[PDB]
Amino acid sequence: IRQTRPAFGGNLMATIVCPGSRPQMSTVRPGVMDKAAYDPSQKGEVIKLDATFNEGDIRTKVLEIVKTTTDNISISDADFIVSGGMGLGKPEGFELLKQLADKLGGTVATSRACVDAGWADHAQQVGQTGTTVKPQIYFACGISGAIQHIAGMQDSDIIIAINKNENAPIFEVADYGIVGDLYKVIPAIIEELDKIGK
Amino acid sequence: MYFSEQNKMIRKLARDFAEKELTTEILDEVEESGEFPQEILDKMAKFGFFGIKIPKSLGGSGGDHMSYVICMEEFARVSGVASVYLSSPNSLAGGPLLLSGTEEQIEKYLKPIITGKKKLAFALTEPGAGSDAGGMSTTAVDMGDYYLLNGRKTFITMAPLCDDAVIYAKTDMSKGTRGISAFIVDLKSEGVSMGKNEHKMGLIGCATSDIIMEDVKVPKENRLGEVNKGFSNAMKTLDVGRLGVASQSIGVAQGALDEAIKYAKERKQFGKRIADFQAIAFMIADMATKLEAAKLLVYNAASLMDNKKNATKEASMAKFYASEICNEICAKAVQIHGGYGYIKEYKVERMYRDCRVFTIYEGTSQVQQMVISGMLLKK
Ligand SMILES: Cc1cc2nc3c(=O)[nH]c(=O)nc-3n(C[C@H](O)[C@H](O)[C@H](O)COP(=O)(O)OP(=O)(O)OC[C@H]3O[C@@H](n4cnc5c(N)ncnc54)[C@H](O)[C@@H]3O)c2cc1C
Ligand SMILES: Cc1cc2nc3c(=O)[nH]c(=O)nc-3n(C[C@H](O)[C@H](O)[C@H](O)COP(=O)(O)OP(=O)(O)OC[C@H]3O[C@@H](n4cnc5c(N)ncnc54)[C@H](O)[C@@H]3O)c2cc1C
Numbered sequence: 001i002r003q004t005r006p007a008f009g010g011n012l013m014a015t016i017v018c019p020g021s022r023p024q025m026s027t028v029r030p031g032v033m034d035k036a037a038y039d040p041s042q043k044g045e046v047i048k049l050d051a052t053f054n055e056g057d058i059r060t061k062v063l064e065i066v067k068t069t070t071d072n073i074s075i076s077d078a079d080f081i082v083s084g085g086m087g088l089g090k091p092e093g094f095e096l097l098k099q100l101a102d103k104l105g106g107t108v109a110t111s112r113a114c115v116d117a118g119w120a121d122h123a124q125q126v127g128q129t130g131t132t133v134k135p136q137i138y139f140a141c142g143i144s145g146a147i148q149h150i151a152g153m154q155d156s157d158i159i160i161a162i163n164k165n166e167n168a169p170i171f172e173v174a175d176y177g178i179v180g181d182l183y184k185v186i187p188a189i190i191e192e193l194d195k196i197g198k
Numbered sequence: 199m200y201f202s203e204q205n206k207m208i209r210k211l212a213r214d215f216a217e218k219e220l221t222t223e224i225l226d227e228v229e230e231s232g233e234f235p236q237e238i239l240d241k242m243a244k245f246g247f248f249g250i251k252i253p254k255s256l257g258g259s260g261g262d263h264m265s266y267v268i269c270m271e272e273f274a275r276v277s278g279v280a281s282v283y284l285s286s287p288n289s290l291a292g293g294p295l296l297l298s299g300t301e302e303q304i305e306k307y308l309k310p311i312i313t314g315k316k317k318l319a320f321a322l323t324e325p326g327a328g329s330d331a332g333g334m335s336t337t338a339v340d341m342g343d344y345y346l347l348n349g350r351k352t353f354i355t356m357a358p359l360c361d362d363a364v365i366y367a368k369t370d371m372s373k374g375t376r377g378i379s380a381f382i383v384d385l386k387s388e389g390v391s392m393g394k395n396e397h398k399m400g401l402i403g404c405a406t407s408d409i410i411m412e413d414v415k416v417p418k419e420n421r422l423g424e425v426n427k428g429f430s431n432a433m434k435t436l437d438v439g440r441l442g443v444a445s446q447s448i449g450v451a452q453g454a455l456d457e458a459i460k461y462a463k464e465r466k467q468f469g470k471r472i473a474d475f476q477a478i479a480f481m482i483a484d485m486a487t488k489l490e491a492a493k494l495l496v497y498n499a500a501s502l503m504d505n506k507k508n509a510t511k512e513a514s515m516a517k518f519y520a521s522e523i524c525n526e527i528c529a530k531a532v533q534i535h536g537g538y539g540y541i542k543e544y545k546v547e548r549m550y551r552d553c554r555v556f557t558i559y560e561g562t563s564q565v566q567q568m569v570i571s572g573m574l575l576k577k
Contacts, residue, residue, distance in 0.1 A: 086410075113410075116394035144350060146325040165348070167335070167371075169326065 001026075073107050075124060080106030081135045081156075083126060084114070085149075087142015087163065087182060091119035096186050097141060103193050109133065111149050127152045141182045145170035162186065199497045201264070208265045212247070212272040220277045222545075228403040229548070232395070234283055243314030247273075248287045252296070257309055263438070263500040267445040274449025275456075278552035279403035281449065285442040286356060287311045291318035293435030294364055294380060298423025307362065307382065319360035319385075320439075321351045321409050322432060329565050331366075332375040332429070336411065338367035345381060345416045351409040353559075358392050358405045360385055365409065366428055378429040380422030389414030400551030436561065438503065441513045443560040444496045444520035447553070451489050451524045454531040454549045458482060461535050478534060485527045492519050511573050518566035521556035528553045 001024045004015045018024050075081065082097040082104075097108050110120040112127065126133055127149040138156040143149060145168050153159065154173065161174035162182045171177045178185055201209070219238060228234055242248060250266045252258025266288055274281035295308045310316035327333045336349025347367050357363065362384050370377030383390065393408025422431055459482055462473040472478055496516040502509040528550040532539040539546045557563045 113393070144325075148325060167337075169335075 005029075075107050075109045075126070075133060076131060078106040078133075078135055080104040080137045081109050081133055081153075082106065082139040082141065083109035083111065083143065083153075084141045085111040085143030086113035086117070088114070088119070093142075093183070094120070096183065097139070099190060100139065100186060103190060103198065104137070106135065106137075111143050140170045140174065141186070143170060144168060145172075199264075199494070199501055202262075205262065205265050205268060208261065209268045209272060211245075212269040215242075215245070215247075216273045216276040216280065220280060225277055225548075228277075228279060229542075232402045232405065234279060234403040239283060240314055242284070243312070247284060248314055249292075249312040250288050252288070252292055252308070252312055256304065258312060263441070263503040264497065267441065267448075267496065267500045270442055270445035271449040271452065274446035275453035278401050278446065278450055278549070281446040282355065282401055282404045285439065285446075286320070287318065289439045289442045290320040290355075290435065291364070293438060294320075294422055294431050297434060298380065298427060298431045303382070303420070310361075316362065317356060317360040319354050319357040319363040319409070320435070321354045321357065321363050321365045323351060323353045325350065325352045329562060331432070332378075334366065334368050334378065336365070336367040337371070338369045338379055338381065338416075340369070341415075344418060345421070347381075347383075347411045347414050347416060349411055351411075352393075353396070353406060354409050355406050356404055357385070357407050357409055358395065363409060364422065365411070366432055369426060373426065375429050377426050378432075379425045380428035380431050381416050382420040382422065383411075383414065383416050385409070387414060387416075399554060400548065401555065437510050437513050440517040440560050441496070441500055441503065441509075443556060444499075444513070444516040447517070447520035447524040447556050448489070448493050448496055450549050450553045450556075451520075451527045454528045454546055454553075455482075455485055455489060457544075457546050457549075458485065458531040458534050461539075465536075472534070481530060481534065485530055488523045489527060492516075492523055496520055511570060514561075514566045514569045514573075517560065518563050518570070521553075522563060524553050524556055 002015050002017060003024075003026050004013060006013050080101065082101040084093055084097050088094070091114075094108050101108055108124065109126050110124040112125055112129065114120045115122055115125050122130075125131065127146075128151045129148070130152055132152040134153075134155050134157075136157050138153050138159045140159055140161040140163070142163060145163075150170070150173060158175045159170075159173055161168075161170045161177045162185050163170060163177075163179065164181055166179050219241065224235070224238075239248075246259045247269060249258040250261045250269055251263060254260040270281055270284060273284055291311055292308060295304055299307070307316070307318070311318050322331055324334055324336060326335055334349075336351070337347060339346040345367075347365070349367060351365065354363070362382055364380060365383050366378055366380050368374075368377060369379045385392075389412040391410040391412065393410060395405045395407050398406065422428055459473070462478055462482065463471065465472045467475075473482070499509050499512040499516040502512055528546075531546050532550050535544055535546050538544050541547065561569075
């Protein structure tokens, strides 16, 4: 089996193989493959094993299991970011992006235009005066694109832009670009999101 | 140079005035509360300082360029922010009106600001476009009965206090420097919005923010001169403005020097007075000769403007050299005051902070060198 994986924080791929080892085993990442065909209801050969437990042959014993809802999450710690600028018009736009960020599991960031307008707090701002982010995804929604912003997210692994005017600089580092009003584009993005199963 | 006897009189006026109305008590309150007292602006326009170079033919004052520099210098000596409130209607606001504006536009726009009823901001700089003003991104679209604009301007002096603002937008996006028109926009209109006041290091008393334009419609009757001339309009205003900036450079210089030799006469160390130590006295000399040398630089530029020959290089040298050696002077004056010159009560520290922007705005010293060398090597 030719096992491939990313190592070195994702900077050096390596195909590690086990020649003198039987069996061959590998933890495989969630999301890389996809689903197979379901309900041919082929057969089954349900085989038995023994489950022959002992008189303290399991030293790990569980007291409680907890399921938390982690809602506090720093723009610096996040893995997915939905940032919004003056292309919202109203302070209530962040709800939309909050909807977007929730299907992904990340926070909402802001540009200076909104902070100096009163739509958000400085803790959220990104750029040279703001705070630098290196997420796995960044959403550039209604931001002109001043270097004062582009400076603090240049190394985002992939940048997706949503602007009305095509002559916005942000499309210089946009890996994927979409021209339009975000209030129409944003909800449609969430639609096809759940439709495949996240 | 040699001053015409009326200009010497004007020098006397601006001296006694700036000295009498800009007291220590006031200027401290201006630094603490970044608000210049409207009563003083009115007081200035009432004696015409708001209209120095605009002539009586249009209801101005009938002075020469040298009179604008004189008032700029003698004011700036006493307070920097006063100068900012002074140059705007004389040069930066009353400039483009004076060049590419019809008589009606001048009737409805210029006389208010000469009399101090209205305030006009000269708005050119964008976040992406600084030195390279030609790389603007603000757009201007022709709809027939009005123009439609969408863009953003940073570092706009006095803007939250201004009633109308001259805004440069790109009409023909392909022509670049050849395709820029200039429009007058009433800031109270639709779409127009202001950014936060910027917290600057010095020159505190005059607000400075962004002008944000979101689908703001502007009537055709408020365009500056012919279409796509606007850039040359803004340049040719920028030359006299740069004369302004060098003028205040030379002003705050004279002030900080005057505090320098005053403190150096009065303070005694090791038994001698400060000024009797050779290092100091020579230092005073050095500052003085440079200051004069270059006072002569700038006086000359303005005299050229007054006799109508192109002053585009000479002014650029004046702004460059004047602002740089102004900073050197301001610092050295701190150093003469010694420790005490680091506390805000000693005027020299306010100067030192004010005089720092002088090398950046109105075209950086680098832009100045680009202009000058580019003017000398063409063959
Ligand atoms: C000292 C200083 C420091 C600064 N530091 C920073 C910093 O760290 N970070 C920062 O970001 N800025 C900073 N700025 C400000 C920066 O230069 C810009 O002013 C700021 O980026 C403008 O906001 P914006 O980026 O959202 O673009 P804006 O121009 O404010 O947004 C307008 C854009 O959105 C589009 N749009 C409008 N409506 C819609 C809509 N309905 N749908 C979609 N698109 C739409 C417009 O076409 C345009 O492209 C600083 C400024 C100064 C003076
Ligand atoms: C933030 C701050 C913290 C300080 N903390 C302390 C502290 O903890 N302890 C302390 O003791 N002090 C402290 N000081 C004071 C500082 O150490 C003194 O100011 C310094 O030693 C010089 O004194 P002066 O400023 O009075 O200089 P002055 O002698 O009053 O000023 C004379 C000026 O002329 C020059 N000069 C002086 N003598 C001669 C000479 N013979 N020939 C030629 N030129 C001359 C000097 O360069 C100076 O510019 C502090 C000052 C500041 C601003």
